[PDB]
């Protein structure tokens, strides 16, 4: 017999050191009911275990695997008419890449790959995608119908912050209900498979808090070094120093966050002792997600909301009009292009042991992540919600983005992700919050944004308002964007 | 067979119009299986009808007056025995009136007259008499033992933030979970048996914003009114045109409210046509609420917001150092003393019969109503939570009314209101909300209020500060204890 004669539904893959020991021949015995071939792992301390089950003998063999303790991992690969289904999914999505995708291709995949955990973010990419056709739409024509006003325009404005907030409550309570649906109601398997936690979540806010306030010091540190050297240091070379300012941060970040999670994110999830892995994953994710907030969008806000304004007061011990426009391209356009770019057997049972290696070695091989997944499109969400009435053209270039990067992952997480979710039945949370926080912050910003400068003395953009009225215009903006989204939530959820 | 032999479990009014037909003939046949005495009701157009049932036949019983359409009320009378449990229970609460009320003498009203909503308004003020008593206390010694700074002290200020906050959460996520657990709970039979109705309520917040306006405005010319007569007009009469202020106010407020009532609350909420009478009660309530909150509320915030701080401003076309302290006086003493003084058959035969009868004319003998008494308690906690930082000694008379009013409210819900719950089974909303906004809107105006008189320079208490400040401190104290709430309240929705 052969492993392609085979056709396994799932490889129970074993560290050969314990192979050595005769469970493994143990474990042949107790597959008794179900064929089974055992092929040496990717190195020594590994061996493959190719079989194939039922919906019957199913339940039998997961309640040993537990009992079991001696293997590394279990992992439900996907048979020859399996595979040749989802590559055919494939093909169809490649055709019409330009066009948005559609709702009956994510219907079929949901029931063959029958992982909650794709559609969910699928979903969300889908309606993100659907949602930014019109935007992109107002955007380009507020760009050229408007040209003469296209920076910080206020209909344009008032547009993003609706768009904003119904976005919001539209994906919270009208399509992520009847997909978290799916969470639980097919929840086939995991193949992974109270208040005192609250409490000690609690006692790290303040560690969270001085760690933010050292990144935001340090980010202030570099800029003012930055505008010290570009406009009052008179070096000959002037380029090479240009380059300091970016390498300080670009070294300081990493080695922030390095000794952030070493000394403190990890002691203290430790010391929360979650019930669940996932749970603990998803602190560690929600207490490193500070670190990313601030390096991402605080450069933008110390560029508009000082810099520009109380530039005049530190002239002494001429403010660049088109800093932020070069700032925003940089972080819109380039910076999500590079996010793309760096993120004796026969023939047929090579390309299956070949496979399984892939699950368990490469990178790609890795299981569908959700969180990292997540925290990309809700960064480049903040982005297109803080600051796209500076450059209308932010929709646009976040749909391309946008296309180009679910035709990736689609490939990816289909053909090349290790599966979790078997078809026979045995036996979104911190980015929700994430999303509204994004969603009240960029009403919030977006409008003070185009308080601030719809009529600024800058030319082709100081203000002609004081800083009593525009922190009063935020505390109003917030508290209307707070009201109106809860209208929007109390609407959506009564049906 | 007399009426007291008979001792009825509930009594069948019927209109004696229709009992002119022989309709009173055909429910007694149905009532061939329980025994039945019929007897002339209060009026000429009612009959009485003194029914003992049981739990096995209950259920057709009121499937038949479901499809009989022609009765009037039906009413759970309480029997001989449980009379006599509910006057030994009322018996053993007026002893020990000065004691905080126990919670098993809540259980055994719970088990005895199975009233979901009893227990829950009376579970509300049991919780907030034990959360007063300590409250009570710390104004008792902040007073005495620092009787220097009496008047706007810091610590007595946070310790009020911190109470309201901590009672809110605690009576939000760990009492009324439990105690509303129990309204379907038990459910046994209340007597009386979507996206649209909430866009159509939706659309009334310009009506109330106006009508708000429209008091507001005539609320701020009577206090200008009353300034000018008491500080710049020189007429004989100072005492009889002082009347004149109240005068205008409370001939203006009931016909503001009539006519808000007649003309728009009720054709609005017809348009709404809410499917159960409940809803459409609650959101007639609602509405409601704005009238009174800003007729309770408004004429304190402008003696302490206004009046105070820009009194000097308005001297050309001296303030009362102590118009605050007496308005508090009176709003929070005299005002809740008015409140509570304002709020040939056998003679057994004929006390059941009158018992019938003030069940159903009396006004003490209407059925309990809970957003009428849970509206008086959430206002006296408005003034207690928004204006306590003037004097300490609100907690204490809050405490004393609330004994008193408990000791009458039981007695009457218990002993005098008509039942609405079966023993046998047969086939809080708004003021949750409301209570939540009180408490945040008590901790600003504390904060602020401590924030602007801690250090002012009318004597025995012209700000320190400038209006910036203060607008900057209220929201930043508003944000602080939204913060804290959901803190709180994740930590206690853990459990």
Redesign the interface.
């Given at each position: 017999q052969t492993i392609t004669s085979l056709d396994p539904n799932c490889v129970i893959v074993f560290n050969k050191t314990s192979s050595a020991n005769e469970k493994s021949l143990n474990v042949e015995f107790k597959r008794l009911n179900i064929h089974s071939i055992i092929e040496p792992g990717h190195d020594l301390q590994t061996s493959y275990a190719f079989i194939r089950i039922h919906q019957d003998n199913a339940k039998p063999l997961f309640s040993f695997l537990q009992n079991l303790d001696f293997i590394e991992s279990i992992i439900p690969y996907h048979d020859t008419e399996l595979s040749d289904d989802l590559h055919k999914l494939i093909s169809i999505s490649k055709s019409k890449i330009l066009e948005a995708p559609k709702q009956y291709e994510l219907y079929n995949l949901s029931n063959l790959t029958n992982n909650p955990k794709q559609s969910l973010y699928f979903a969300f990419l889908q309606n993100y995608i659907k949602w930014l056709i019109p935007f992109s739409f107002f955007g380009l024509s507020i760009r050229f119908l408007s040209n003469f006003t296209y920076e910080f325009n206020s209909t344009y404005s008032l547009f993003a912050i609706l768009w904003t907030l119904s976005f919001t409550a539209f994906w919270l309570y009208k399509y992520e209900p009847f997909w978290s649906d799916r969470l639980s109601k097919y929840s086939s398997f995991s193949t992974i498979e109270?208040?005192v936690?609250?409490?000690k979540k609690?006692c790290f806010i303040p560690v969270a808090l001085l760690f933010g306030a050292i990144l935001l010091s340090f980010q202030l540190y570099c800029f003012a070094l930055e505008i010290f050297i570009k406009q009052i240091y008179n070096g000959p070379m002037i380029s090479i120093l240009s380059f300091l300012p970016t390498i300080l941060i670009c070294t300081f970040t990493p080695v922030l966050t390095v000794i952030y999670n070493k000394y403190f994110v990890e002691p203290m999830t430790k010391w929360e002792n979650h019930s669940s892995v996932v749970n603990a994953k998803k602190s560690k994710e929600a207490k490193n997600f500070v670190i990313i907030f601030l390096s991402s969008y605080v450069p933008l806000l110390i560029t508009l909301f000082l810099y520009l304004p109380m530039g005049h007061l530190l002239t002494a011990e001429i403010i660049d009009t088109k800093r932020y426009e070069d700032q925003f391209f940089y972080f819109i356009v380039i910076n999500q292009l590079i996010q793309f770019s760096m993120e004796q057997l026969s023939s047929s049972d090579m390309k299956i042991w070949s496979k399984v290696k892939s699950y368990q070695t490469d990178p790609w091989g890795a299981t569908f992540d959700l969180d990292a997944n997540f925290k990309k499109l809700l960064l480049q969400f903040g982005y297109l919600v803080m600051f796209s009435t500076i450059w209308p053209l932010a929709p646009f270039i976040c749909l391309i983005v946008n296309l180009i990067v679910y035709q990736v992952d689609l490939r990816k997480a289909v053909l090349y992700s290790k599966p979790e979710y078997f078809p026979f039945p045995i036996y979104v949370g911190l980015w929700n919050s994430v999303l509204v926080m994004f969603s009240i912050l960029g009403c919030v910003i977006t409008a003070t944004l185009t308080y601030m400068y719809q009529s600024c003395n800058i030319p082709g953009v100081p203000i002609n308002h004081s800083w009593?009225n525009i922190?009063?215009y935020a505390?109003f903006i917030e508290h209307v964007s707070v009201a109106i989204f809860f209208?929007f939530s109390?609407?959506?959820k009564?049906?």
């Amino acid at each position: 017999q052969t492993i392609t004669s085979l056709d396994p539904n799932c490889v129970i893959v074993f560290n050969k050191t314990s192979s050595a020991n005769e469970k493994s021949l143990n474990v042949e015995f107790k597959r008794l009911n179900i064929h089974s071939i055992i092929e040496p792992g990717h190195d020594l301390q590994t061996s493959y275990a190719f079989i194939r089950i039922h919906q019957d003998n199913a339940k039998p063999l997961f309640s040993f695997l537990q009992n079991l303790d001696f293997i590394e991992s279990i992992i439900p690969y996907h048979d020859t008419e399996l595979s040749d289904d989802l590559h055919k999914l494939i093909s169809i999505s490649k055709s019409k890449i330009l066009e948005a995708p559609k709702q009956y291709e994510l219907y079929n995949l949901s029931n063959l790959t029958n992982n909650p955990k794709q559609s969910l973010y699928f979903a969300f990419l889908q309606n993100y995608i659907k949602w930014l056709i019109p935007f992109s739409f107002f955007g380009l024509s507020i760009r050229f119908l408007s040209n003469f006003t296209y920076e910080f325009n206020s209909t344009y404005s008032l547009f993003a912050i609706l768009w904003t907030l119904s976005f919001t409550a539209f994906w919270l309570y009208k399509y992520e209900p009847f997909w978290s649906d799916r969470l639980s109601k097919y929840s086939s398997f995991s193949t992974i498979e109270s208040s005192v936690i609250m409490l000690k979540k609690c006692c790290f806010i303040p560690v969270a808090l001085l760690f933010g306030a050292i990144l935001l010091s340090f980010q202030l540190y570099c800029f003012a070094l930055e505008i010290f050297i570009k406009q009052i240091y008179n070096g000959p070379m002037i380029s090479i120093l240009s380059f300091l300012p970016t390498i300080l941060i670009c070294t300081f970040t990493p080695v922030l966050t390095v000794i952030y999670n070493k000394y403190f994110v990890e002691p203290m999830t430790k010391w929360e002792n979650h019930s669940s892995v996932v749970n603990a994953k998803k602190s560690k994710e929600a207490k490193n997600f500070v670190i990313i907030f601030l390096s991402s969008y605080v450069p933008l806000l110390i560029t508009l909301f000082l810099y520009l304004p109380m530039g005049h007061l530190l002239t002494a011990e001429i403010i660049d009009t088109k800093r932020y426009e070069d700032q925003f391209f940089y972080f819109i356009v380039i910076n999500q292009l590079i996010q793309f770019s760096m993120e004796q057997l026969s023939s047929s049972d090579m390309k299956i042991w070949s496979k399984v290696k892939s699950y368990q070695t490469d990178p790609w091989g890795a299981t569908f992540d959700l969180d990292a997944n997540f925290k990309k499109l809700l960064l480049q969400f903040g982005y297109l919600v803080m600051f796209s009435t500076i450059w209308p053209l932010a929709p646009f270039i976040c749909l391309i983005v946008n296309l180009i990067v679910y035709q990736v992952d689609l490939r990816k997480a289909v053909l090349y992700s290790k599966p979790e979710y078997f078809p026979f039945p045995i036996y979104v949370g911190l980015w929700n919050s994430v999303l509204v926080m994004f969603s009240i912050l960029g009403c919030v910003i977006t409008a003070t944004l185009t308080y601030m400068y719809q009529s600024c003395n800058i030319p082709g953009v100081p203000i002609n308002h004081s800083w009593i009225n525009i922190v009063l215009y935020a505390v109003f903006i917030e508290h209307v964007s707070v009201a109106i989204f809860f209208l929007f939530s109390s609407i959506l959820k009564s049906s």
